[PDB]
Amino acid sequence: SRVVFQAEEERNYHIFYQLCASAALPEFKTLRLGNANYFHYTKQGGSPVIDGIDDAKEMVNTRQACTLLGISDSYQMGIFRILAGILHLGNVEFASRDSDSCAIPPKHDPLTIFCDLMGVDYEEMAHWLCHRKLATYIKPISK
Amino acid sequence: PRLSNKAFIIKHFADKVEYQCEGFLEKNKDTVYEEQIKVLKSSKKFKLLPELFQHKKTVGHQ
């Protein structure tokens, strides 16, 4: 539940914050992050920083531990890239349309980044966010 | 609770705990759509993303 919800003065799991504080770094620029108040999955509890902790230094320590246990630097970028896509996926907004249905806004900046990061089609994903197989007839879902 | 219709009390081992019903249903829901998983499984730029993935599923039952 914590992945998509937080209550007052709580954070999501630490790795998401370690990633946002490391956003302006050169290897992380394809992940396209802003600060923690940007993303829906990391802003809910209003608490973005823990007193006494540098989330970026802890990311340096986290990456170093992955290096020690043999998660090759190619796979390390793998993990961080999936987490960045979960973060961008959370800012996909849905706009209600006729007959209790919905659709994404045209050329959506969070969705475009999500699809780029994962390497899927944009339109195939945008369709199946708002639609569902009923089994074989295709039917729109409510917001 | 005498003054609430939106909360319930369980007497657990150690002590009583009042639980507030608000937010229980939404947190419990966990039903992924199959279609959406196929979109991800069929990737061609990312080795790790298809390596992850080999009535009604819910957080409580899990």
Whole-number Å distance between alpha carbons of A134 and A136: 6
Three-class SS state of B39: helix
Task: Out of A118, A129, A133, name the one closest to residue B43 (CB).
Answer: A118
Q: What is the 3-state secondary structure (H, E, C) of chain A?
A: CCCCCCCCCCCCCHHHHHHHHCCCCHHHCCCCCCCCCCCCCCCCCCCCCCCCCCHHHHHHHHHHHHHHCCCCHHHHHHHHHHHHHHHHHCCCCCEEECCCEEECCCCCHHHHHHHHHHCCCHHHHHHHHHEEEECCEEEECCC
User: Which has the closest alpha carbon to A89: B59, B40, B53, B60?
Assistant: B40
**Residues A77, A102: contact at Cβ < 8 Å?**
no
Task: Read off the amino acid at residue B21.
Answer: C
- Judge whether B49 is closer than 8 Å to chain A, CB to CB: yes
Whole-number Å distance between alpha carbons of A17 and B33: 28
Output DSSP code: residue B2.
T
**The two structure tokens encoding residue B18:** 């009042």
Phi, psi of A48 (to 5 degrees): -110, -20
Q: How many CB atoms lie within 10 A of CB A87?
A: 27
- Measured in angstroms, the resolution is 24.0
Distance from CA of A39 to the nearest CA of B (A): 19
Whole-number Å distance between alpha carbons of A114 and B46: 13
Whose tokens are 């937010």? That residue is B23
Using a 10 angstrom Cβ sphere, with 0-12 exposed, 13-18 middle and 19 or more buried, the burial of residue B61 is exposed
Name the method of structure determination. electron diffraction
Closest chain B residue to A123, measured at CA:
B39
∠ CA(B31), CA(B25), CA(B19), 5° rounding? Answer: 140
What is the phi-psi region of residue A58: left when phi exceeds 0, alpha when psi lies from -120 to 50, beta otherwise?
A: alpha
Three-class SS state of B1: coil
Size of interface A-B (CB pairs under 8 A): 41
